[PDB]
């Protein structure tokens with residue numbers, strides 16, 4: 001036992017076409033977000049950079065470090081983000 | 096670990112006889128992906 005839309009094809013009984021995107025925030029580790037503006041990298045002058053979520057200020061001078069594919073970014077002794085992998089190019093930039 | 100089930104693989108040309116010699120070879124993460132479920136039992140098929 002149910003009902004049925006009485007959709008006569010002729011004036012104020014026009015329905016609407018709906019899609020609802022319901023959200024959750026406590027079910028698991030986060031799996032969906034939005035795109036982040038891939039602003040062009042700038043070399044040899046001090047800039048405000050944010051790579052892979054790592055935030056800092058410095059000079060992204062060119063480097064050719066041999067980062068392994070799984071190495072999302074790099075560091076050095078004393079826990080300093082000396083190097084980083086700039087994405088969209090798999091290139092390494094020395095901070 | 097912490098929801099992210101992490102998958103590691105490593106293929107080596109060791110062909111028996113040695114019976115697990117010194118395995119100084121490292122173990123890179125082939126993929127690190129968010130499943131999000133606790134595990135305490137398994138069985139390896141063949």
Ligand SMILES: *[C@@H]1O[C@H](CO)[C@@H](O)[C@H](O)[C@H]1NC(C)=O
Nearest residue numbers: 035037038039087088089090
């Ligand atoms: C992603 O990587 C490809 C590699 O061919 C590159 O052409 C593209 O510019 C990169 N970024 C975007 C905008 O998808």
